[PDB]
């Protein structure tokens, strides 16, 4: 039963990659995440077993809210609706809760209200190249960036206006590669990751040590 | 023809480069390699044979003697050092042999300049 | 038996029964715009001297042949190109010398920097025809833009003993002295700019250090010969 | 009708019904060692300005294309070579301009010197891409190494009206404005060194001077376009 060691069964697992909070009375109460696979070390190491990858994206959002302190004699906030906007690479990006970018028709968005099943959206392989690259030995100049790996950005905000009390919401983004194809195996990462942007490392031993060659 | 006459345990590489007439002689191993050349490994072969091409001013026959004319050169360079085991002499010698290879011909018999 | 191979105006000799490692089971082929066949020749780089304290050498591929004849000329002429390679590595050693070499070609060998916040500069990442040497010590962090050249991490933060996953050949002096690796074109795009991206990195790392008795030659030359295969570039004319 | 001719990465336009003069009834062909087809392209030299006082212009062939792309590159690279030519001469004039030109290609146009005891220097015999001009006056003998450029002798001590024996075409502004001469390879040897011997000399001599009324353009540009044909050089490899 070698089926569980296939590329699909190895990489097609949902994982929480990003976590953020946003309140509804700040003008800045919006969460953003540039989609990248280097956020989580465990997922980064599993993807870096290969050089070139091609996969689809399935995103599931777990949004929960919590009541913040207020002075109102009575608070009776209705059900909250949230907007999750996906900005494709090169699309307009918001800087405030009230911004035109939130209404761009070419920026697909999901409107979801609390109490239902969590929202879910899928993004396909959107690179002008033929595959994503986990390693790039060259310059774009910055070494090893390869801007052909841009996957877009996600934005989240409250749709409802603020009522008689603030509401703070937290969003958990779940990331799942689908229909994955991998090329050019590479040695597993041995040194601890130091920076999210580069492969920099501090030299470490090859393995754990024993007392002598004869144990 | 070049014959390596070192010990059977000596190893090394030589770059034999041919410069066509007009082109200058190489000044470095790199320049020699960028031109027409053969890498000669004495550890694998004891002899190397090169047949330099005719290449003349569409003259078919050319003068035996010459005057400040494009000549064409053959040169040899150390690709690697001579690797030798213990108790084996590193200093060796090479012998060169010459002969006519392709359709050689002569014309207009004359007196040899070597006699008084 | 000795086999002589001539490519263009260059010729080299190899042991007839030498084993060739094909990179990933794929031979270099043409893109299924403008090819060049005068580049199809052997480029013998400068030989390096394997010593007792040698840690290793590496050469970035496109860059190593950037100052060699028409291939370099084509590199500055055309903006885009793609090519495979055939790499010959040969050692000249006697039967009184001992040592083991790993000859591996790493695709997209992105290397780290000694300073964790910066990235290595081009000069430290590649020396063109000149070889870059690994170090058996750890480069200090004070250094700002040098490659972390500790051999046991191979400059990539991985176990050096795991480099065998990449197309490779072992050179055990008591058994063999030459290696031949045929590397196809590997990229995420059909064609790329050869001056800003090094597709391949050839590495030679001594796993067993060179040893010899007094009197023997205190060095073993290593010769690298690279022949571009199925090279082709972008067109420059109208439609 | 207009016919467009493209050679390599260059294209020119000619009147469809233009008459081509083949040199001696023989088209350029290959020697019955190494050919080059990237040289097969049009080389448009700098245009010259035909004026009222113009005496004539000439260009030595191999030399004129000595600083043009691969053809010049091949000239310094290879020691020996041979080639034919196709020469296009075009004038841009209106119907209000009058004049007659002789366009002749002279094989082995050896030229005399103003000083009877010396020979002309290379600079005076050829200007490369730049044109050399004839003179309606006689160059003084005091001059030591200049060409005797009196037009009526054509610098060869012959009657200029007898130049029609060489492959030629007349350009009468009232009738035609272009000339096309196809010149084969002509030499006493199958191949020759291109830097020390000018096989061909193209001459343009106004037999009837350019004339026009006030208001018209005081010049008529003459454009020379040369396309080497069936070029081949000596090999550079072993046997």
Contact predicate C32/C191, CB 8 Å: no
Reported resolution in A?
2.2
Residues 6 or more apart in contact with residue D222 via CB below 8 angstroms = D47, D48, D49, D50, D57, D89, D90, D91, D101, D204
Pairing of β D20-22 and β D178-183: parallel
Token reading at A86: 């996906």
Q: How far apart are CA D231 and CA D45, in angstroms?
A: 19
Can you point out the beta strands (E) in A159-214? 167-185
- Of C113, C163, C188, nearest to A187 by CB-CB distance is C163
Residue C96 has, within 13 A of its CA and on its CB side, a CA count of 17
| Nearest-by-CA chain C residue for A189 | C158
Q: How far apart are CA C34 and CA C82, in angstroms?
A: 10
Token reading at A122: 């899928």
Q: By the CB < 8 Å criterion, does C209 face chain D?
A: no
Please tell me what DSSP assigns to residue C69.
H
Q: Per DSSP, what are the bridge partners of residue C59?
A: C202
The number of beta carbons lying within 10 Å of the beta carbon of residue A38 is 17
What's the first-to-final CA gap in chain A, in angstroms? 35
The number of beta carbons lying within 10 Å of the beta carbon of residue C173 is 22
Question: Min CA distance, D122 vs chain B (Å)?
Answer: 20
Pairing of β C48-50 and β C220-233: antiparallel
Question: Min CA distance, C148 vs chain A (Å)?
Answer: 8
- Of C110, C119, C122, nearest to A142 by CB-CB distance is C119
Q: Is there a contact between B50 and D31 if contact means CB atoms under 8 Å apart? A: no
Which residues of chain D are within 8 Å of residue B36 when distances are taken between CB atoms?
236-238
Residues in chain A: 215
Q: Please name the residues between 26 and 45 in chain B that touch chain C, using a CB distance below 8 Å.
A: 29-30, 33-41, 43-45
Pairing of β C48-50 and β D168-172: unpaired
Query: Solving technique for this entry?
Result: cryo-EM
Phi, psi for D74 (deg, rounded to 5): -65, -35
Selection from C163, C126, C151, C131 nearest residue C55 by Cα: C151
Residues 6 or more apart in contact with residue C223 via CB below 8 angstroms = B13, B79, B80, C44, C45, C47, C88, C89, C90, C91, C92
Q: Is there a contact between B58 and D238 if contact means CB atoms under 8 Å apart? A: no
Q: Is there a contact between C129 and B45 if contact means CB atoms under 8 Å apart? A: no
Q: By the CB < 8 Å criterion, does C58 face chain A?
A: no
Can you point out the beta strands (E) in A68-205? 81-87, 109-113, 120-123, 132-133, 153-158, 167-185
Selection from C232, C183, C179 nearest residue C204 by Cα: C179
Token reading at B44: 């694998």
Residues in chain D: 239
Which residues of chain C are within 8 Å of residue A148 when distances are taken between CB atoms?
188-189
Phi, psi for C82 (deg, rounded to 5): -155, 145
DSSP alpha helix (H) spans, chain A: 7-11, 41-47
DSSP for chain D, please give it: -EEEEEETTEEEEEETT--EEESSS--------EE-STT-S-EE---EEE-TT---EEEEHHHHTTTSHHHHHHHHH-S-EEEEEEEEEEE---TT-EEEEEEEEEET----BSSTTS---HHHH-BTTBPEE-BSSPPPTT-SS-B--BGGGTTTTS-GGGGGGSSEEEEETTT--EEEEEE----SSSSB-TTT---EEEEEEEEEEEE--BTB-S-EEEEEEEEEEEEEE---S--
Q: How far apart are CA C85 and CA C78, in angstroms?
A: 19
Q: How far apart are CA C132 and CA C201, in angstroms?
A: 11
> Largest alpha-carbon pair distance within chain C?
68
Which residues of chain C are within 8 Å of residue A125 when distances are taken between CB atoms?
none
Please tell me what DSSP assigns to residue C162.
G
DSSP for B15-81, please give it: EEEEEPTTSPPPSSHHHHHHSEEEEEETTT-SEE--------SS-SS--SS-SS----EEEEEESSP
Q: How far apart are CA C168 and CA C199, in angstroms?
A: 16
CA C16 to chain centre: 22
- Distances in Å between the Cα of D51 and the Cα atoms of B49, D100, D205 are 65, 12, 12
- Of B35, B51, B57, nearest to D189 by CB-CB distance is B57
Which residues of chain C are within 8 Å of residue B40 when distances are taken between CB atoms?
13
Long-range contacts, D113-119 (Cβ 8 Å, 24+): D113/D145, D113/D146, D113/D147, D113/D148, D114/D139, D114/D140, D114/D141, D114/D143, D114/D144, D114/D146, D114/D147, D114/D148, D115/D141, D115/D143, D115/D144, D115/D145, D116/D141, D118/D144, D118/D145, D119/D145
> Largest alpha-carbon pair distance within chain A?
77
Q: By the CB < 8 Å criterion, does B11 face chain D?
A: no
Residues 6 or more apart in contact with residue A103 via CB below 8 angstroms = none
Q: How far apart are CA D72 and CA D78, in angstroms?
A: 10
Contact predicate D73/D36, CB 8 Å: no
DSSP for C94-135, please give it: -TT-EEEEEEEEEET----BSSTTS---HHHH-BTTBPEE-B
- Gyration radius (Cα) of chain C, Å: 18
Q: Is there a contact between A185 and C165 if contact means CB atoms under 8 Å apart? A: yes
Contact predicate C36/C231, CB 8 Å: yes
Question: Min CA distance, B87 vs chain D (Å)?
Answer: 39
Q: How far apart are CA D233 and CA D193, in angstroms?
A: 10
Q: Per DSSP, what are the bridge partners of residue B2?
A: B48, B96
Grouping H, G, I as helix, E, B as strand and the rest as coil, residue C138 is coil
> Per-residue b/e over A157-177, b at no fewer than 16 CB within 10 Å?
bbeeeebebbbbbebebbbbb
Which residues of chain B are within 8 Å of residue D195 when distances are taken between CB atoms?
none
D and C make contact (3+ CB pairs below 8 Å): yes
Q: How far apart are CA D76 and CA D193, in angstroms?
A: 10
CA D234 to chain centre: 25
Please tell me what DSSP assigns to residue C62.
H
Contact predicate D88/D180, CB 8 Å: yes
Selection from C196, C6, C186, C233 nearest residue C84 by Cα: C186
Q: By the CB < 8 Å criterion, does B21 face chain D?
A: yes
Pick among C129, C217, C218, C226 to test the B interface (most B CBs inside 10 A): C217
| Nearest-by-CA chain C residue for D238 | C9
What's the first-to-final CA gap in chain D, in angstroms? 52
Q: Is there a contact between C119 and A52 if contact means CB atoms under 8 Å apart? A: no
**DSSP tally for chain C: helices H, then strands E:** 3, 14
Neighbours of B, requiring at least 3 CB pairs below 8 Å, are: C, D
For chain D, which residues lie within 8 Å of any Cβ of chain B, measuring from their own Cβ?
A: 31, 33, 78-80, 82, 187, 189-193, 234-239
Selection from A47, A54, A51, A44 nearest residue A129 by Cα: A54
- Distances in Å between the Cα of D11 and the Cα atoms of D3, D173, D206 are 10, 25, 28
Q: How far apart are CA D215 and CA A198, in angstroms?
A: 72
Token reading at D70: 């691969």
Neighbours of C, requiring at least 3 CB pairs below 8 Å, are: A, B, D
Q: Is there a contact between C157 and A148 if contact means CB atoms under 8 Å apart? A: no
Q: How far apart are CA A12 and CA B13, in angstroms?
A: 54
Residues in chain B: 116
Question: Min CA distance, C94 vs chain A (Å)?
Answer: 31
Q: How far apart are CA A96 and CA A87, in angstroms?
A: 15
Q: How far apart are CA A100 and CA A105, in angstroms?
A: 10
Q: How far apart are CA D128 and CA D40, in angstroms?
A: 19
Question: Min CA distance, B62 vs chain D (Å)?
Answer: 12
- Type and span of the H or E element at C61: helix C61-64
Which residues of chain A are within 8 Å of residue C150 when distances are taken between CB atoms?
203
Q: By the CB < 8 Å criterion, does B71 face chain C?
A: no
Q: Per DSSP, what are the bridge partners of residue D227?
A: D86
Which residues of chain C are within 8 Å of residue B90 when distances are taken between CB atoms?
217
The number of beta carbons lying within 10 Å of the beta carbon of residue D85 is 25
């Amino acid at each position: 039963s070698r089926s569980e060691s296939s590329i699909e069964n190895f990489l097609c697992r949902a994982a929480c990659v990003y976590y953020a909070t946003y309140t509804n009375n700040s003008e800045k109460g919006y969460a953003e995440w540039v989609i990248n696979t280097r956020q989580v070390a465990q997922l980064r190491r599993k993807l870096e077993l290969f050089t070139y990858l091609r996969f689809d994206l399935e995103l599931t959002f777990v949004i929960t809210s919590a009541q913040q302190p207020s002075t109102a004699t009575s608070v009776d906030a209705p059900v909250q609706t949230h907007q999750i906007m996906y900005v494709p690479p090169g699309g307009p990006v918001p800087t405030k809760v009230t911004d035109y970018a939130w209404q761009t028709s070419t920026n697909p968005s999901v409107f979801w209200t609390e109490g239902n099943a969590p929202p879910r959206m899928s993004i396909p392989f959107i690179s002008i190249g033929n595959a994503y690259s986990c390693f790039y030995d060259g310059w774009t100049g910055v070494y090893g960036i390869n801007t052909l790996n841009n996957m877009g950005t996600l934005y989240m905000r409250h749709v409802n206006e603020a009522g008689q009390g603030p509401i703070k919401s937290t969003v958990r983004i779940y990331f799942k590669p689908k229909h994955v194809k991998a090329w050019v195996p590479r040695p597993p990462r041995l040194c601890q990751y130091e920076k999210q942007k580069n492969v920099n490392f501090t030299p470490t031993g090859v393995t754990t040590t024993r007392v002598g060659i004869t144990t | 023809t070049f014959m390596f006459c070192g010990s059977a345990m000596a190893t090394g590489k030589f770059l034999l480069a041919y410069s066509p007439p007009g082109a200058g002689v190489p000044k470095n191993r790199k320049d020699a390699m960028l031109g027409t050349h053969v890498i000669w490994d004495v550890g694998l072969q004891s002899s190397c044979v090169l047949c330099v091409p005719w290449i003349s001013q569409t003259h078919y026959r050319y003068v035996v003697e010459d005057e400040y004319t494009a000549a064409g050169y053959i040169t040899c360079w150390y690709q690697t050092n001579i690797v030798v085991p213990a108790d084996v002499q590193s200093s060796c010698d090479i012998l060169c042999f010459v002969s006519a290879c392709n359709d050689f011909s002569v014309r207009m018999l004359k007196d040899t300049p070597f006699i008084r | 038996r000795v086999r002589s191979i001539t490519l263009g105006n260059s010729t080299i000799t190899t042991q007839e029964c030498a084993n060739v490692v094909v990179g990933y089971g794929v031979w270099p082929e043409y893109l299924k715009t403008q090819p060049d066949v005068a580049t199809c020749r052997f480029y013998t780089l400068e030989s390096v001297q394997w010593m007792k304290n040698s840690a290793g050498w590496w050469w970035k591929l496109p860059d190593a042949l950037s100052q060699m004849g028409l291939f370099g000329q084509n590199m500055q002429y055309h903006y885009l190109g793609r090519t495979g390679y055939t790499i010959h590595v040969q050692c000249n050693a006697s039967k009184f010398h001992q040592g083991c070499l790993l000859v591996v070609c790493v695709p997209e060998a992105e290397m780290g920097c000694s300073n964790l916040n910066n990235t290595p500069e081009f000069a430290e990442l590649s020396g063109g025809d000149t070889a870059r040497m690994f170090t058996d010590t750890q480069i200090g962090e004070t250094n700002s833009k040098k490659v972390q050249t500790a051999v046991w991490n191979a400059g990539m933060g991985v176990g050096v003993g795991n480099l065998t996953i990449y197309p490779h050949q072992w050179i055990n002096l008591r058994t063999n002295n030459s290696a031949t690796i045929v590397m196809p074109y590997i990229n995420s795009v059909p064609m790329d700019n050869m001056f800003r991206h090094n597709n391949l990195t050839l590495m030679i790392i001594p796993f067993v250090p060179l040893n010899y008795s007094e009197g023997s030659s205190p060095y073993v030359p290593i010769t690298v010969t690279i022949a571009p295969m199925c090279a082709e570039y972008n067109g420059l004319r109208l439609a």
